[PDB]
Design a protein around this ligand. Structure first.
Ligand SMILES: CCC1=C(C)/C(=C/C2=NC(=C\c3[nH]c(/C=C4\NC(=O)[C@H](C)[C@H]4CC)c(C)c3CCC(=O)O)/C(CCC(=O)O)=C2C)NC1=O
Ligand SMILES: CCC1=C(C)/C(=C/C2=NC(=C\c3[nH]c(/C=C4\NC(=O)[C@H](C)[C@H]4CC)c(C)c3CCC(=O)O)/C(CCC(=O)O)=C2C)NC1=O
Ligand SMILES: CCC1=C(C)/C(=C/C2=NC(=C\c3[nH]c(/C=C4\NC(=O)[C@H](C)[C@H]4CC)c(C)c3CCC(=O)O)/C(CCC(=O)O)=C2C)NC1=O
Ligand SMILES: CCC1=C(C)/C(=C/C2=NC(=C\c3[nH]c(/C=C4\NC(=O)[C@H](C)[C@H]4CC)c(C)c3CCC(=O)O)/C(CCC(=O)O)=C2C)NC1=O
Ligand SMILES: CCC1=C(C)/C(=C/C2=NC(=C\c3[nH]c(/C=C4\NC(=O)[C@H](C)[C@H]4CC)c(C)c3CCC(=O)O)/C(CCC(=O)O)=C2C)NC1=O
Ligand SMILES: CCC1=C(C)/C(=C/C2=NC(=C\c3[nH]c(/C=C4\NC(=O)[C@H](C)[C@H]4CC)c(C)c3CCC(=O)O)/C(CCC(=O)O)=C2C)NC1=O
Ligand SMILES: CCC1=C(C)/C(=C/C2=NC(=C\c3[nH]c(/C=C4\NC(=O)[C@H](C)[C@H]4CC)c(C)c3CCC(=O)O)/C(CCC(=O)O)=C2C)NC1=O
Ligand SMILES: CCC1=C(C)/C(=C/C2=NC(=C\c3[nH]c(/C=C4\NC(=O)[C@H](C)[C@H]4CC)c(C)c3CCC(=O)O)/C(CCC(=O)O)=C2C)NC1=O
Ligand SMILES: CCC1=C(C)/C(=C/C2=NC(=C\c3[nH]c(/C=C4\NC(=O)[C@H](C)[C@H]4CC)c(C)c3CCC(=O)O)/C(CCC(=O)O)=C2C)NC1=O
Lengths: 162, 172, 515, 172
């Protein structure tokens, strides 16, 4: 996936050359930022269930018209799939935090996102609201830099959805 | 291509699971010992011509048949290609040392290489011998404690050794 | 179609559905536990003392009927429910109450210090029974702890009976609940602030019903009934009188209770308890999290995202950066573009420093030609001709030119015939120009981007064997298209191209029938 | 009614011995974590209305027979009694959490409460269910890291869960 180290190696390889000062300094930055990013992922993993339940509830509060009979938000299967989707997004956000790159998101979620959402008539706004929630509670869950990395990745997901 | 982190993520996705506390600890330890990894990668990169020249001299001393008329490194073209191969293999081994995963080797360096040599007629035993000679030449530069803070880096020596071995094993 | 039901039954049905708001719906159903609002206090037999009887209060100014009723209530409470004959009625005490010399609290103190109270509840009793009764009759509750019995026993032993009665009546709890004006009542049948869990059961144990009494004149005598339960800190007995097993017998409080099966479900093979486990998973928990966890169960296909590209060995050929080279470019961008162009256009073949085109690179560096014109030059160059044209058949050259200049495999035999005729009638340069001046090339690469391998993704107009033909033509990241392989530079797709496929498809169709 | 200190004192007294060094260290550790204990007690006390409203909503959504005509929580009187009981049991759980010992809960709240609910014809299983829901809501409120200095408090969470489970098991 597209991370700092993998981009470094891909650029070095595409030009057929070794790793020089620039590439090693980039990798050094990755290895320093690993600490805030990894423990932000730890904090996000710990509070995953509450975050997912709250994101689903926020979707329903903003979109009450999905849950009454006849459309996407109705039924135990649909709501379970909603929980599954928000958990997917959170999982890949934590993956991206650990890997220090949007490679997990870009490769697993964002690639093909619009075609899939169009085919199944899933509104991207639902997931935008869920991720905005996730952002709200990661603001209070996380402090200092960890908050910063988690916000960068959550917002990359949001931007891709919008 | 994958690094150590992406390898862990890929294995966790097959489980539909987040990364465990233990696996996150392993990744944090990998990151904290990343300056040593950077120094090892710089050792391989900065001393690449020395490593390749040492390996070439030893390889063509051991196997004189490679440089006779009819050998696999006889005209200037075949020797130039041989030196290019050695440089490429060392370059990818350094890529793998930085990444932490042998994935770059299997996906790129050793992807169609055994079949390439087999179709060309290259003696793959000799290529694996050149790779082992490069490993020997590279260990002396990895272990060099001059101009770097002294510490325990035996794990990096073992990892680089295994990457060289993976290259040689895929060849032969 | 006439009336299917007689009008009398339609009327009966309509009036049954009318007497209920909303008619008969799934949400307005009656509760299967058919408990009236008065169920508990009625089955327990405490309706009168808990709710129905009012609290009797007597202030100093009062009329005759209030006084007489207050005295009736006082004697019916303080003296147990025991009959108090006329020779026992205290006349001076109630004269003092009527004048206002003493309150109701002082009257209660006088009555509890009188020999009616002593003879009933003190002189034929153990001290435990006396303390129980005193709590019930003077505080309206039961003893909560063993410490109260120890305290009151010591207080009587030291200071005598009157100090004990004072402690009951001069207590902050007596004044909180009854003050000076209202008769004591049984107060633990409703939750008050300082209650304890055992108070309800213990009082209900001390309360023998409306027609029961605390009489010393039982044949067993006057016996303590909480002497053992208070020391063990146990609750009290909730067995009520026999007259009450005819009240609200159709209530079903234990509606949620599960009837056990006659025999337990056993699983003889995979162990004995698996049906109980399956049952618990199905029923015990909500369906929502059940479905959520079922959706996230790891698949039996253990396929990563790059699975499938690792199989055909084209992860690198897909994840290479797309190189674009504009007109103002830096030195590093230029050198990288040259590296990519040589790695692709020359089939991953080693090109030596003596074979590199310096004039063409100069023309590209200036801006005299584009990436496209540079590629056209390189394809017309002796490097390309020698490696891909002059030691090959035209089939190999055509497939290889498709792969290297379009990034895809030929789709049919018409391409082979077309390009062979083109070379034969117009030469090699026109054949290269067809590739580079093609609409496909311009659509995908267009004058500034280096060619790349497209055919590892579906292309519109592809023939479903183009993907396979590219996988066959592609040899991996470390593979080349050299003419120095042992057998020569030989064609790969001739039979597949001409045949259109493997030639096994009709038999695949036959197999996908019966067998 | 006694706390952890007096519990240790009672066990020491029955033997007839001083408190051992291990016991004194245990009590001192309790005193040192007492600040986090106060935080947890305050989390319970502050968010009690929300806890009980949530547990009531879930209990009556799960068990509709209580709130429909004939049900044990049907008229306003019995609904008020139900919510009041939830108030009470939460109160005594917080008391026990502060004391470090469930003696206050068992002695003053739970002891004769099964007998009360049997006599009144109240579903003891439904009361246990309400105590469990109120447990889950309380656990959501305790783990709130907002406005409180961050640190490990797993022992407090487990202890509060033990108190809630003891209440549920005694009532049922
Ligand atoms: C510009 C590219 C770049 C490089 C090269 C780089 C290397 C680098 N090496 C460091 C120290 C170090 N370097 C080494 C590695 C050596 N120990 C043994 O002698 C081996 C021979 C050898 C490794 C195989 C060790 C062990 C430390 C001390 C840090 C530690 O032990 O945790 C440090 C931290 C300085 C400190 O000690 O506080 C860095 C940043 N960083 C960069 O940004
Ligand atoms: C809720 C209304 C209510 C009722 C019904 C009631 C009945 C009642 N009758 C009692 C005694 C009694 N009841 C009787 C009556 C029987 N003996 C005779 O042989 C007759 C055959 C028969 C009556 C027709 C007698 C003789 C006693 C006195 C028992 C004794 O002194 O040993 C007592 C014991 C009170 C005491 O002695 O201090 C009560 C409580 N009390 C109430 O508050
Ligand atoms: C007025 C008629 C009457 C009497 C006399 C009576 C006895 C009585 N003894 C009691 C306790 C006691 N009684 C004793 C005495 C015994 N324990 C020792 O082993 C000795 C062998 C023995 C005395 C010779 C003790 C030690 C207690 C306290 C036990 C405890 O706290 O558990 C108590 C409970 C109050 C308390 O805890 O102090 C009563 C009510 N009850 C009555 O209604
Ligand atoms: C994934 C990156 C990558 C690798 C690894 C790679 C290796 C590679 N080496 C090649 C040729 C060659 N490789 C060798 C090297 C061998 N000669 C023996 O004497 C030595 C023992 C031994 C070297 C240690 C030689 C001699 C040739 C040319 C054969 C010939 O000209 O006939 C070729 C064929 C391309 C060409 O002939 O121009 C490839 C693809 N290419 C790549 O793009
Ligand atoms: C540059 C070296 C080279 C050659 C020469 C070559 C021959 C060649 N001849 C072909 C077709 C053909 N070739 C022939 C020739 C036959 N007609 C009668 O049968 C005769 C017995 C016989 C000639 C005396 C025919 C008729 C076709 C058309 C086949 C068809 O349309 O099915 C094709 C398939 C594409 C096309 O239709 O043009 C090739 C590739 N390929 C090469 O790479
Ligand atoms: C013109 C006729 C034609 C067809 C139809 C065609 C299909 C086709 N499907 C492909 C991949 C794929 N195709 C599928 C679809 C399958 N897997 C799912 O589970 C389903 C069970 C099932 C579809 C109902 C999937 C999942 C991939 C991705 C495989 C991968 O790269 O890992 C690819 C590889 C390139 C790409 O990923 O876009 C082709 C070429 N190609 C053609 O030239
Ligand atoms: C025996 C007499 C009795 C009454 C009167 C009674 C009222 C009552 N209505 C309730 C539900 C409710 N009732 C309403 C009524 C509102 N809906 C809006 O459309 C209106 C503006 C407004 C009505 C005028 C609402 C919003 C609730 C849901 C409250 C909640 O649980 O969040 C509840 C909560 C219990 C439940 O979950 O159903 C009670 C106790 N219950 C009784 O046992
Ligand atoms: C200090 C410790 C203590 C407690 C906790 C306590 C509870 C208690 N609950 C009572 C009634 C009640 N309690 C309930 C509660 C039930 N209803 C639903 O089923 C729910 C499952 C459940 C509550 C979650 C109800 C409905 C009643 C009324 C029943 C009746 O009065 O007939 C009563 C009888 C007096 C009254 O009605 O106020 C007591 C004493 N008493 C104590 O001394
Ligand atoms: C007026 C009543 C009162 C309050 C409100 C109180 C809270 C309180 N918590 C403190 C520290 C703390 N409080 C906690 C507890 C938290 N750890 C996790 O975040 C949990 C969510 C949560 C408890 C379950 C922790 C871990 C510390 C730091 C370690 C310690 O000093 O014991 C401190 C010491 C100074 C500080 O670091 O903030 C106080 C005064 N103390 C009091 O006497």
């Amino acid at each position: 996936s597209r991370t700092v180290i993998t981009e470094v190696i891909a650029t070095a390889d595409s030009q057929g050359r070794f790793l020089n000062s620039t590439e090693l300094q980039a990798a050094f930055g990755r290895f320093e930022r690993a600490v805030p990013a990894i423990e932000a992922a730890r904090a996000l993993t710990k509070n995953q269930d509450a975050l997912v339940k709250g994101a689903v509830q926020a979707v329903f509060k903003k979109f009450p018209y999905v849950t009454q009979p006849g459309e996407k938000g109705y039924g135990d299967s649909n709501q379970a799939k909603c929980a599954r989707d928000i958990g997917y997004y959170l999982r890949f956000i934590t993956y991206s935090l650990v890997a220090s790159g949007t490679g997990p998101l870009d490769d697993y979620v964002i690639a093909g996102l619009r075609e899939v959402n169009r085919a199944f008539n899933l509104n991207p706004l639902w997931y935008i609201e869920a991720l905005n929630y996730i952002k709200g509670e990661t603001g209070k869950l996380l402090s200092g830099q960890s908050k910063t990395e988690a916000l960068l990745y959550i917002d990359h997901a949001i931007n891709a959805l919008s | 291509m994958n690094d150590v982190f992406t390898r862990a993520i890929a294995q966790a996705d097959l489980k539909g699971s987040f990364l465990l506390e233990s696996d996150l600890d392993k990744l944090a330890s990998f990151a904290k010992e990343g300056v040593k990894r950077l120094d090892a990668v710089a050792a391989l990169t900065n001393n690449a011509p020395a490593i390749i020249s040492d390996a070439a001299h030893k390889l063509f001393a051991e196997q004189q048949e490679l440089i006779q008329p009819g050998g696999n490194a006889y005209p200037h073209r075949r020797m130039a290609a041989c030196l290019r191969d050695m440089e490429i293999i060392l370059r990818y081994v350094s890529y793998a040392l930085l990444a932490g995963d042998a994935s770059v080797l299997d996906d790129r360096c050793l992807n169609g290489l055994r079949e390439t040599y087999n179709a060309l007629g290259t003696p793959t035993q000799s290529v694996a011998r050149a790779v082992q000679l490069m490993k020997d030449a590279a260990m002396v530069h990895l272990k060099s404690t001059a101009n770097v803070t002294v510490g325990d880096c035996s794990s990096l020596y073992s990892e680089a050794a295994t990457y060289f071995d993976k290259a040689a094993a895929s060849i032969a | 179609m006439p009336a299917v039901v007689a009008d009398q039954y339609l009327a009966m049905a309509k009036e049954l559905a009318a007497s209920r708001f909303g008619g008969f719906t799934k949400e307005n159903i009656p509760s299967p536990m058919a408990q009236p609002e008065s169920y508990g206090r009625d089955r327990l037999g405490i309706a009168a003392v808990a709710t129905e009887n009012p609290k009797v209060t007597l202030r100093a100014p009062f009329t005759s009927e209030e006084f007489q009723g207050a005295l009736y209530a006082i004697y019916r409470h303080i003296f147990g429910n025991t009959y108090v004959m006329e020779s026992e009625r205290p006349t001076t005490a109630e004269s003092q109450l009527k004048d206002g010399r003493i309150t109701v609290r002082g009257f209660i103190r006088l009555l509890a210090k009188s020999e009616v109270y002593k003879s009933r509840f003190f002189q034929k009793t153990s001290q435990n029974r006396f303390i129980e009764l005193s709590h019930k009759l003077l505080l309206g509750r039961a003893p909560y702890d063993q410490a109260e019995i120890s305290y009151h026993l010591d207080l009587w032993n030291t200071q005598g009976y009157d100090a004990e009665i004072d402690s009951y009546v001069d207590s902050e709890e007596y004044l909180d609940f009854f003050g000076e004006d209202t008769v004591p009542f049984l107060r633990d049948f409703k939750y008050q602030t300082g209650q304890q869990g055992v108070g309800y059961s213990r009082l209900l144990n001390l309360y023998d019903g409306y027609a029961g009494s605390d009489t010393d004149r039982a044949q067993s005598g006057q016996k303590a009934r909480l002497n053992g339960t208070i020391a063990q800190a146990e609750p009290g007995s909730i067995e009520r009188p026999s007259a009450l097993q005819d009240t609200w017998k159709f209530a079903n409080p234990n509606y949620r209770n599960a009837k056990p099966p006659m025999v337990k479900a056993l699983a003889l093979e995979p162990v004995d308890l698996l049906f109980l486990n399956m049952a618990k998973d199905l029923t015990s928990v909500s369906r929502a999290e059940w479905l959520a966890k079922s959706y996230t169960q790891p698949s039996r296909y253990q396929q990563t995202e790059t699975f499938g590209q690792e199989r055909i060995g084209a992860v690198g050929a897909i994840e290479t950066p797309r190189i674009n080279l504009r007109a103002p470019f830096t030195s590093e961008e230029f050198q990288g573009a040259l590296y990519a162009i040589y790695r692709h256009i020359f089939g991953n073949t080693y090109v030596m420093e003596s074979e590199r085109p310096t004039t063409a690179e100069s023309q590209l560096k200036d801006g005299r030609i584009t990436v496209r014109g540079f590629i056209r030059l390189l394809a017309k160059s002796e490097v390309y001709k020698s490696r891909f044209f002059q030691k090959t058949s035209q089939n190999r050259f055509i497939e290889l030119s498709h792969k290297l200049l379009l990034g895809r495999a030929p789709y049919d035999q018409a391409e082979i015939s077309y390009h062979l005729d083109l070379w034969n009638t117009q030469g090699y340069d026109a054949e290269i120009d067809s590739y580079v001046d093609s609409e496909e090339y311009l659509d995908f690469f267009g004058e500034d981007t280096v060619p790349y391998f497209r055919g590892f993704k579906y292309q519109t107009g592809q023939s479903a064997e183009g993907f396979n033909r590219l996988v066959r033509l592609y040899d991996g990241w470390a593979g080349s298209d050299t003419d120095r392989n042992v057998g020569g530079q030989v064609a790969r797709l001739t039979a597949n191209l001409t045949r259109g496929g493997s030639g096994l498809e009709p038999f695949i169709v036959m197999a996908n029938s019966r067998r």
